[PDB]
């Protein structure tokens, strides 16, 4: 009772062999169109040859639409895709690689879309990131993507909302002016005094520009580099000029992997033409050739069915842009030794992350506290931002609990005011500080028992890297 | 891979016979079987996907005939009702290329009839 | 579902004659074409793909052309051990079949 329509694959760089067998086993039954999948391998990845592999494939087959891999890193090839498609009016999803890498402003008659975050879900989870430990946004991007005047306007944008505690932004555009004796882009990084420092740019521009920084003295000791993913999302190799690890987000590593990837764009096309079919009972009639031009009003509603689709559990739909609502996204670091090690993980507003605490941070001291009345007053955490904005403080307060597991020195940064607050926020910028505030546990502040000191005083004795501000005689 | 069919007979003149045609991957492979006329026609049975929906007919053997697979043991089942006229043989096809869609086989059975 | 009828009911040819059957549907193909060959009782043998490509093991003596529903398939050279039936097969909807015919020779 289905018919069919026409969907090619194209592999560019291995094995087809997993890829083959993960659809053929997905039963397009209980659907009404079912698919007709078609493998071809090419390894020139020239713009001619895909044309004339693209509309070849279109002039002997009845091709619906196209699911389009890659194992590069070259974000022009997505353009080409985004030319031809409102060129053939059919639907193209690139799924990996620079196919998947995002292109912004694509054209009005374009059906084309792909796997991957927008350019502003990316700021929004690199906002989310540094609302663990209150840092502070201090943006600078050199190159000009067509992503750029999105990545401001949203990263502004939240600074403004409610219970900030945000610093300013100390932002610098620069450009691609091919001038060398203009050194003054080695001379404005000693503009930037903060310890974080976002950078969207280009791989190679940032491979220049990281011999720079080490020039001028951002090292990687006392700053740290949060960068989006289309510089360093090519997760096999890196060049040496990267001791600036936490890079941002990249797709899970693998691309649930490939093939699997490959199953949810043939279920994507063939539930958006069963829709077509189910609700106004004609498909469209597929393209004659890539010469022939005349003899389509309804790729408009094929576009419309496209971007709402659902599958068994995950919605897949997308935006008018042609990113990914919902997908998941990792957290990446760096590794010393050159790997990157790290497996994040962020679902659609919630990140959770690892030892509650950065390593790699003398001048940092441990600060244990108490609470009473009003000189260290302890007050929760607003429900929206998790942070405090006046408080300025952490006060990682450990729980007692069963004892079968450790403390939590993850339990939530309740806020602290107060008296002694305000002082240490004085005395801090007074020599050179750093907190690491706590509250005691056992409750015993100020008390000597036989043989022993206990509270306040018993964590002065432990040699445990101390001061005890607040209220104590 | 290699296909060998069982369950031969029509010892019930308009009875139920669940014939079925075992294989030796089988798994992500649809299914579609043949009887075969005294004009020794291979007009078709019944069709399932791989994944065991899309159960149809033609219009032959239609409202008699009760459908079900097993990709573990990569058998086929359905009762015969309507070859009571038929001496026929049937044999067991695996479609090449696989999917819920079709291809065309060169992977059919081995081939044994059903006679009234 | 669209049902197809192939046509007509004869192969009498001599040996090494010319014999040629059309794959005739209901409705509009796209070249959607197969074809088979068996002994009563043995078993069929692929012939032919879209562009009437043939099969590894199996001859030049078999070849075919038509478009869109209609198609003829000619056979010719035929040595004796091919003493089969020819049939057409079509996939539009899950799968097609009509008659097809049988070899005799004279």
């Known amino acids: 009772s289905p018919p069919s329509i026409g969907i090619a694959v194209i592999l560019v760089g291995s094995d087809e062999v997993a890829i083959k067998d993960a659809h053929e086993k997905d039963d397009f039954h209980h659907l009404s169109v079912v698919p007709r999948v078609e493998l071809v391998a090419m390894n020139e990845t020239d713009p001619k040859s895909i044309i004339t592999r693209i509309c070849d494939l279109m002039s002997d087959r009845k091709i619906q639409g196209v699911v389009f891999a890659d194992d590069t890193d070259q974000e022009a090839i997505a353009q080409i895709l985004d030319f031809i498609s409102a060129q053939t009016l059919t639907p193209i999803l690139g799924i990996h690689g620079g196919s998947s890498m995002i292109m912004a402003d694509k054209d009005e008659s374009s059906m084309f879309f792909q796997f991957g975050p927008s350019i502003e879900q990316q700021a929004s989870v690199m906002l989310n990131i540094m609302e663990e430990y209150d840092w502070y946004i201090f943006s600078i991007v050199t190159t000009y993507f067509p992503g750029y005047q999105d990545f401001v306007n949203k990263i502004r944008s939240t600074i403004e909302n409610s219970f900030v505690g945000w610093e300013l932004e100390e932002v610098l555009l620069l450009d691609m002016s091919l001038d060398d004796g203009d050194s003054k882009i080695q001379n404005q990084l000693k503009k930037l005094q903060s310890p974080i420092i976002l950078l969207y740019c280009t791989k190679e521009e940032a491979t220049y520009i990281f011999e720079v920084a080490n020039s001028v003295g951002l090292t990687g000791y006392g700053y740290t580099w949060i960068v989006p993913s289309l510089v360093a999302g090519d997760t096999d190799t890196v060049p040496s000029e990267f001791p600036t690890g936490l890079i941002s987000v990249s797709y899970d590593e693998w691309d649930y992997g490939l093939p699997a990837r490959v199953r949810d764009g043939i279920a994507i096309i063939t539930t958006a033409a069963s829709d077509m079919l189910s609700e106004h009972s004609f498909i469209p009639e597929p393209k004659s050739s890539c010469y022939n031009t005349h003899e389509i009003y309804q790729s408009n509603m094929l576009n419309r069915y496209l971007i709402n689709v659902t599958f068994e559990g995950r919605d897949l739909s997308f935006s008018e842009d042609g990113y990914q609502m919902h997908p998941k996204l990792v957290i990446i670091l760096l590794n010393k030794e050159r790997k990157w090690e790290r497996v994040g993980k962020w679902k659609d507003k919630s990140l959770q992350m690892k030892y509650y605490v950065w390593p790699r941070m003398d001048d940092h001291l441990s600060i244990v506290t108490l609470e009473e009345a009003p000189f260290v007053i302890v007050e929760s955490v607003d429900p929206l931002s998790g942070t405090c904005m006046r408080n300025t403080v952490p006060c990682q307060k450990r729980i007692i609990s069963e004892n079968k597991t450790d403390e939590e020195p993850g339990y939530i940064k309740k806020c602290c005011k107060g008296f002694c607050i305000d002082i240490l926020k004085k005395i801090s910028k007074s020599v050179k500080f750093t907190y690491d505030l706590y509250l005691v546990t056992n409750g015993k502040h100020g008390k000597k028992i036989n043989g022993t000191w206990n509270g306040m005083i018993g964590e002065v004795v432990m040699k445990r890297a101390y001061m005890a501000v607040g209220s104590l005689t | 891979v290699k296909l060998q069919e069982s369950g031969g007979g029509l010892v019930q003149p308009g009875g139920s016979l669940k014939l079925s045609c075992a294989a030796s991957t089988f798994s992500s492979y649809t299914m579609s079987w043949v009887r075969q006329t005294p004009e020794k026609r291979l007009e078709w049975v019944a069709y399932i996907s791989n994944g065991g929906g899309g159960t149809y007919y033609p219009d032959t053997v239609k409202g008699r005939f009760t459908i079900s697979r097993d990709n573990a043991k990569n058998t086929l089942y359905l009762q015969m009702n309507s070859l009571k006229e038929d001496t026929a043989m049937y044999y067991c096809?695996?479609?090449?290329?696989?999917?819920?869609?079709?291809?065309?086989?060169?992977?059919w059975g081995a081939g044994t009839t059903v006679t009234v | 579902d669209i049902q197809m009828t192939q046509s007509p009911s004869s192969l009498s040819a001599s040996l090494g004659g010319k014999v040629t059957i059309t794959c005739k549907a209901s409705?509009?193909?796209?070249?959607?074409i197969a074809w088979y060959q068996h002994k009563p009782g043995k078993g069929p043998r692929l012939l032919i793909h879209?562009?009437?490509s043939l099969q590894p093991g199996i001859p030049s003596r078999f070849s075919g052309s038509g478009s869109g529903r209609d198609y003829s398939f000619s056979i010719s050279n035929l040595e004796p051990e091919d003493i089969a039936t020819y049939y057409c097969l079509q996939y539009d909807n899950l799968y097609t079949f009509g008659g097809g015919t049988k070899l005799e020779i004279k």
């Open positions: 096809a695996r479609p090449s290329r696989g999917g819920s869609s079709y291809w065309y086989f060169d992977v």
């Open positions: 879209y562009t009437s």
């Open positions: 409705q509009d193909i796209n070249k959607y």
